[PDB]
Design a protein around this nucleic acid. Structure first.
Lengths: 511, 701, 249
RNA sequence: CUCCUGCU
RNA sequence: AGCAGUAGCAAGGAG
């Protein structure tokens, strides 16, 4: 019972991995059984104190909270897979039987006349014009014959790459040659870009109401008792009745329907190229309608692991002049004219190649779960307010309470716009949806470090005299992870403007 | 007009505007390619933190050994982290530790630990994560690798009759004494292996990349051990688990209130308190297991004789573990056309085809490389001792130097909150530099970039930001609301269970619960292709519901997965949908749904929609089809033993003789008992008896 | 006459060659690690493959003989219900589930299923007969306790329950005779008068015993009185910034 | 030329 | 081409 199997090799093993002033495990155990401490410990402690050279840094005397270094370089392009602000859509009344996406593609082929969709072979700008021209003609006659299977030509064999991968040769045969096929490896890292200036306009556009009403297909309300279900149902009715009108809901339903259709077509047809519409579904004058924003082309995904990076080709419908700064990765073509009754303005066809992935589908196709942090935030505001007042003041608190947002452009010093609380939850669903779009590594590390600087600002707000030990490596770690993601650079700029606004009352910062 | 969300913080707290700063709605970061450079960074940086060059030759392993205790080359750059522990200092802190609470402390907790060791059955090993099967050199779940290990035991010499923990451990050491071990490879041949290769293979730990972690820019490598290292680590984690449960300065919301409220009562007329949130960096590369061997030689300097020898093996196996090197790298020509793959075996011969960073990492790891692995001797990787370094944290936070200026606080895995009590700010420099001194001596490196402090409670602990009065709550994982995907009945109520348990523990204000409830309803209906009857959906499942709806009398008794609306609410998240619709169903509908005679259920909620989809098709098309033959034979034998013992899934079937002999003894037992009070027939008793005798002669042959 | 069938199955499974090296070589406990051979890694996205399954036309494996005893090949407009691709098990679609649920025969089993889930019907019965009041909107909070949360009337402690089902359902290899038997053996004399003749299988009976007798004690943040009547309604009664209770009886 | 995949 | 982010995918395997 009380005997362990004393082996032969392990007793030579445990005697080998003892500390250096010991010979065997037995001598180490006999010293550890009879160990009594002393007060030469303090001599080793103070002897560790003397050779340290480390001082803390206060903030009331050396408030070196300098603003971050935005890279002053070429402006970061528009890197979202679709178009948010610059869209144009064709409408029709929605038919209940004609509901599948290829049926929607055909019904919008007769509805929006593609016979007048004549493009010159010369783009305004871009890189490859002939390939997208013959691709658009080939898919236009392909939708004309009402069958979604692109016949193999050199254009699709060039764009959605077939045969464009390296020959992975294992090290069983190598057939070496004298100074020929000299092979090695090389990595670079990431490219650095600058501050985008267009992101304010898509922010203010994306939180503005659009006359088409509801966009997100939510579900029905459960029945309520005489309990607090009147409260939660009331908050769902008011908040849901606010978020259904903005363009953020149109983008979320666009991602759900479009990436849902490309997702099920990535399941059902590997190895075959489809033609998938880019659309929505929303209510217009009571009559439920559907949209049509663009045309997507799949790239014969054989999704082995969660990655795989299949090719998506997006033909887009715009009605604005292009931009070689913002719309830089695009290959802007044209279309013609559209009658827009407020006269018959222009219509531009855009082109873009891009890629999606299998892990980058289920976080986009299930992006409806963004009403949790917004309603959590507004609900913690209201519940903390009535928790500090101890009186049922909810419905009148949702109108007579201000929220400071959106300082102006020319001046910033205490010049803010106090808005109502439902416009605050508009901006909250905007910033949560922008979090759900642009998630990379850089946003994660920058959210960590802005949690630290937010802790410093809260340490400023109540005069607590915060302090840090080493600020050089701190700004070395923050400026490492601000490279090319536009949301991260934009939030860094707005964090600097947060310090500029907060510098007017508290004293822990710079100009 | 510009716009800035962070202006919400101009007149608020950070207990309300902090859920705004978690990017949990997006995709998590994934790794790509091999996981070689991360492992070489971990081991190479671990030896770079060694602060020594003293090598000791080995006779067991053909590579050198560098020690990590009491051999310090004190460079002047002491702000850089060190990986050297002084043993008299930490044993002095242990003797100082037990003198604060009780006298017979370690004997008490260690006797309770051994009181829970000897009553443990080793099926507890199968309730774990993925491990490293050394038979085929892969990653397998725990019961598979344990079954292949016991298969190597009963294939090599004799059989196994242990059915405990300690006899299995002695069986592992008995495998270490063996000169030759036979096992099976792939189509199932049987090979043999020597003695030194078995020693090199039992100490093999696999490395990989940590996938899906929120909070870092650079990726980090996690390592999984084999099977023969796990149960000793389970013993140590039960011991230190009882020690951490007994201690009072370890972790989560009440203890900070008791220590802040109590240490505000220990203030004189001129003293004050300053708290500091820190973050101990490089925690997995500065905990050498030799100090675990010495301190566990203290806690088992006074336990017994068996526990004294059994709690001193897993630190040795962490002292001479190997490290798997991923699967190599890739090379390509100037035209970027052909790309050869070099594995971890031929990395030595093809050394001259690498980058500058790779050759910088590789030439400082060359004198420790084996053929496939590397030799690490002081590292403590992820997937290892977690509740034992916390004891070192409490030992740093219970120091007594003798004024009346001192510190206290709270410790976690690598997160700590420290409270100092002093009189002036240069004395604060003295005490905090004493804290960096004692942590720096013991082997705990605080990072200077990620630390701060104030006077009141405004601190940070395990992503809970405590302000002066109010409490921040943990930002939960959003995909955890929908994780089942198994049934039309065990997904919605599972989501209500997740909303319930996230409502009780966290705050989770009710409108968020109603909103996420209706959203999880919407993804349920969108997943299982079922819509309500009044909707305009016309697919292959709503036409049947649309045509036959006139037969149903009361419309709101239909299930959600059959075309009914929602009746659950916040105040009924603990009750499934089926009962609250069973109080209203039509009798043809209730008698029609709840028939157990259905082709779907035959071949926790009410299982009336439980169907089994078809499996994948690489189960008979790969080279591992014989493994599917093994799972089919195992399901047949388990259905045989389940067919004899009518109630076997309730109690764990202990016993150490055999299965088929207990089967034959049970059929003879019920044959005699059901004979004499029952059957009585000569052809049946002699015929069943004839089948038992012929099956026993068939099994013995 | 079941022992003859089990003898046929036992001789049939000892007839195999390489299965002789499977049994009488391992132990009784090894059955547990003979149960788990799930060579799938983690199934880290089950809902993804569930949506991939339900999006196809025939994802489901179902029995043939009952559905060919009662079902119809196709519905009235193009709805497929049957396959002939592969033992005799037939792949179908989820339309056959709801088609059984609206156009299938019925077997009267209402009282049995209303007797299986008596704990949850007790929960709904206690929920339907309660009354509420106004809210308060005040601060609240108290520490975490280990609370038994079910209105049971026996209050065993997760140890006499497994032993109880051993000494109720199958006593031939039940347990070593302890000192915890006698009054629970009077309870054996009461309980064998209930589960003797039923159509319910033994696994479902062993399931339903352990939910009428077990006070489920968990470590939860509680406040106020610690009566187990209001502990399953813990998530409803109060949150962090609000509180509601006006129950008279 | 065919077959097979869809976490191995 | 492109997706990328410290190294991968842009199909692969067998007969």
């Amino acid at each position: 019972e009380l005997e362990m199997y004393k082996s032969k090799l392990f007793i030579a093993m445990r005697d080998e991995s003892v500390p250096l002033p010991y010979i065997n495990y037995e001598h180490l155990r006999t010293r550890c059984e009879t160990f009594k401490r002393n007060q030469a410990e303090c001599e080793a402690k103070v002897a560790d104190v003397a050779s340290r050279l480390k001082i803390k840094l206060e903030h009331l005397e050396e408030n070196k909270l300098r603003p971050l270094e935005i890279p002053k370089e070429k402006e970061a392009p528009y890197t979202h897979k679709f178009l948010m602000k610059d869209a144009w859509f064709f409408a029709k009344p929605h038919d209940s039987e004609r509901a599948q996406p290829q049926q929607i593609l055909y019904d919008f082929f007769e509805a929006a006349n593609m016979g007048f969709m004549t493009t010159s072979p010369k783009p305004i700008f871009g890189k490859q014009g002939l390939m997208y021209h013959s691709l658009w003609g080939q898919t236009k006659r392909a939708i004309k014959d009402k069958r979604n299977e692109l016949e193999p030509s050199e254009q699709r064999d060039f764009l959605c790459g077939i045969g464009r991968a390296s020959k992975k040769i294992q090290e069983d045969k190598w057939q070496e040659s004298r100074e020929e096929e000299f092979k090695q490896e090389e990595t670079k890292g990431a490219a650095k870009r600058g501050f985008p200036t267009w992101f304010n306009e898509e922010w203010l556009w994306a939180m503005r109401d659009s006359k088409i009403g509801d966009w997100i297909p939510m579900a029905e309300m459960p029945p309520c008792k005489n309990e607090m279900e009147d409260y939660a149902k009331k908050m769902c009715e008011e908040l849901e009745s606010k978020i259904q009108g903005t363009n953020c809901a149109r983008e979320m339903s666009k991602l759900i329907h479009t990436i849902g259709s490309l997702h099920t077509e990535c399941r059902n047809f590997p190895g075959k190229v489809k033609i998938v519409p880019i659309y929505c579904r929303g209510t217009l004058r009571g009559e439920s309608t559907d949209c049509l924003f663009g045309i997507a082309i799949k790239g014969k995904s054989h999704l082995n692991k969660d990655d795989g990076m299949y090719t998506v080709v997006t033909f887009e419908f715009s009605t604005e002049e292009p931009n070689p700064s913002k719309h830089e990765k695009y290959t802007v073509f044209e279309a013609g004219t559209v009658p827009v009754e407020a006269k018959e303005k222009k219509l531009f066809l855009y082109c873009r190649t891009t890629g999606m992935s299998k892990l980058k589908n289920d976080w986009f196709s299930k992006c409806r779960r963004c009403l949790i942090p917004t309603m959590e935030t507004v609900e913690q505001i209201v519940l903390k307010e009535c928790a500090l007042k101890e009186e049922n003041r909810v419905s009148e608190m949702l109108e007579n309470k201000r929220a400071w947002i959106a300082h102006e452009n020319g001046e910033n010093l205490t010049r803010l716009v106090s808005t109502k609380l439902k416009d605050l939850c508009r901006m909250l669903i905007v910033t949560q949806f922008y979090y759900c779009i642009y998630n990379d590594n850089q946003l994660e590390g920058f959210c960590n470090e802005q949690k630290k600087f937010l802790m410093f600002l809260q340490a400023d707000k109540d005069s607590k005299s915060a302090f840090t030990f080493n600020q050089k490596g701190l700004y070395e770690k923050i400026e490492e992870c601000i490279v090319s993601n536009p949301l991260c650079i934009f939030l860094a700029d707005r964090l600097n403007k947060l310090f500029l606004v907060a510098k007017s009352n508290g004293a822990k910062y710079f100009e | 007009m510009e716009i800035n969300p962070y202006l919400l913080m101009l007149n608020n707290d950070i207990t309300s505007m902090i859920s705004l700063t978690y990017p949990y709605t997006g995709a998590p970061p994934m790794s790509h390619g091999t996981s070689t450079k991360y492992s070489m960074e971990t081991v190479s940086r671990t030896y770079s933190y060694s602060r020594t060059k003293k090598e000791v030759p080995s006779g067991i392993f053909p590579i050198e050994r560098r020690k990590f205790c009491n051999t310090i080359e004190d460079k002047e750059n002491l702000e850089k982290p060190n990986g050297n522990v002084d043993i008299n200092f930490m044993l002095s802190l242990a003797e100082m530790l037990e003198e604060k609470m009780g006298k017979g402390f370690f004997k008490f907790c260690a006797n309770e630990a051994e009181a829970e060791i000897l009553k443990m059955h080793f099926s507890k090993l199968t309730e774990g994560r993925q491990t490293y099967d050394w038979t085929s050199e892969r990653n397998m779940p725990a019961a598979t690798a344990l079954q292949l290990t016991v298969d190597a035991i009963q294939e090599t010499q004799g059989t196994f009759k242990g059915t405990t923990m300690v006899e299995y451990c002695n069986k592992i050491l008995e495998m270490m004494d063996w000169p030759e071990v036979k096992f099976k490879k792939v189509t199932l041949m049987i090979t043999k292996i020597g003695r030194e290769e078995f020693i090199k293979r039992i100490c093999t730990i696999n490395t990989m990349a940590k996938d899906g972690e929120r909070g870092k820019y650079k990726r980090r490598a996690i390592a999984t051990p084999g099977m023969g290292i796990r149960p000793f680590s389970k013993i140590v984690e039960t011991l230190a688990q009882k020690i951490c449960e007994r201690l009072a300065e370890s972790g989560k919301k009440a203890k900070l209130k008791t220590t802040v409220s109590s240490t505000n009562s220990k203030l004189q007329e001129g003293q004050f308190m300053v708290n500091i949130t820190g973050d101990n960096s490089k925690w997995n590369e500065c905990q050498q297991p030799e100090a675990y061997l010495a301190m566990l030689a203290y806690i088992t300097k006074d336990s017994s004789n068996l526990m004294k020898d059994l709690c001193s093996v897993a630190p040795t196996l962490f002292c001479n573990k190997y490290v798997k090197m991923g699967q190599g790298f890739r090379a390509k020509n100037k035209r970027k056309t052909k790309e050869i793959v070099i594995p971890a075996k031929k990395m030595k011969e093809r050394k001259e085809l690498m980058n500058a960073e790779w050759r910088d990492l590789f030439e400082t790891i060359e004198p420790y490389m084996d053929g496939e692995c590397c030799f690490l001797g002081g590292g403590m990787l992820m997937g290892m001792f977690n509740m034992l370094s916390t004891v070192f944290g409490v030992m740093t936070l219970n120091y007594r130097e003798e004024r009346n200026c001192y510190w206290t606080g709270l410790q976690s895995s690598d997160d700590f909150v420290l409270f100092c009590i002093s009189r002036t700010w240069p004395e604060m420099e003295m005490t905090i530099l004493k804290f960096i001194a004692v942590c720096k001596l013991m082997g705990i490196n605080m990072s200077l970039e990620k630390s701060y402090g104030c006077l009141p409670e405004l601190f940070e602990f395990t992503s809970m930001f405590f302000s002066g009065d109010f409490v921040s709550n943990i930002a939960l994982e959003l995909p955890a609301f929908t994780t089942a995907g198994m049934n039309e009945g065990t997904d919605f109520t599972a989501a209500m269970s997740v909303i319930r348990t996230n409502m009780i523990n966290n705050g989770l204000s009710p409108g968020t619960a109603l909103m996420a409830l209706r959203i999880c309803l919407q993804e349920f209906r969108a997943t299982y292709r079922v819509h309500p009857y009044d909707s305009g959906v016309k697919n292959h499942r709503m036409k049947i519901i649309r045509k036959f709806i006139e037969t149903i009398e009361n419309k709101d008794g239909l299930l959600i997965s059959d075309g009914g609306k929602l009746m659950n609410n916040i105040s009924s998240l603990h009750i499934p949908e089926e009962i609250l619709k069973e109080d209203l169903m039509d009798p043809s509908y209730r008698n029609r749904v709840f028939n157990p005679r259905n082709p779907f259920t035959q071949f926790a909620v009410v299982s009336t929609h439980s169907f089994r989809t078809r499996s994948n098709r690489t189960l008979l098309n790969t080279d591992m089809r014989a493994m599917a033959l093994e799972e089919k034979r195992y399901q047949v034998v388990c259905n045989m033993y389940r067919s004899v013992f009518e109630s076997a899934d309730v109690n764990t079937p202990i016993g150490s003789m055999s299965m088929g002999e207990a089967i034959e003894a049970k059929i003879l037992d019920r044959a005699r008992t059901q004979f004499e009070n029952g059957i009585i027939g000569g052809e049946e008793y002699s015929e069943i008896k004839r089948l038992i005798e012929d099956a026993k002669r068939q099994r013995l042959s | 006459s079941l022992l003859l069938t089990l003898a046929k199955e036992y001789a049939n499974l000892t007839k195999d060659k390489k299965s002789c090296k499977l049994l009488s070589q391992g132990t009784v406990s090894s059955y547990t690690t003979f149960k788990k051979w799930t060579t799938s890694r983690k199934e880290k996205n089950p809902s993804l493959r569930m949506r991939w399954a339900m999006g196809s036309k025939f994802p489901i494996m179902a029995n043939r003989e009952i559905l060919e005893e009662a079902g119809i090949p196709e519905q009235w407009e193009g709805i497929d219900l049957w396959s002939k691709k592969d033992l005799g098990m037939v792949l179908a679609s989820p339309a056959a589930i709801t088609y059984w649920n609206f156009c299938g025969p019925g077997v009267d089993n209402s009282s049995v299923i209303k007797d299986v889930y008596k704990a949850k019907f007790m929960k709904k019965e206690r929920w339907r007969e309660t009354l509420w009041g106004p809210m308060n909107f005040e601060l609240v909070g108290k520490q975490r306790r280990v609370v038994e949360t079910q209105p049971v009337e026996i209050k065993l402690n997760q140890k006499e329950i497994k032993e109880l089902t051993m000494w109720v359902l199958f006593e031939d290899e039940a347990n070593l005779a302890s000192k915890f038997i006698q009054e629970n053996f009077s309870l054996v004399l009461s309980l064998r008068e209930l589960y003797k003749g039923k159509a319910v299988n033994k696994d479902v009976a062993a399931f339903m015993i352990a939910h009428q007798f077990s006070p489920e004690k968990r470590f939860l943040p509680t406040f106020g009185p610690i009566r187990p009547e209001r502990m399953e309604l813990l998530h409803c009664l109060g949150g962090d910034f609000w509180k509601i209770e006006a129950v008279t009886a």
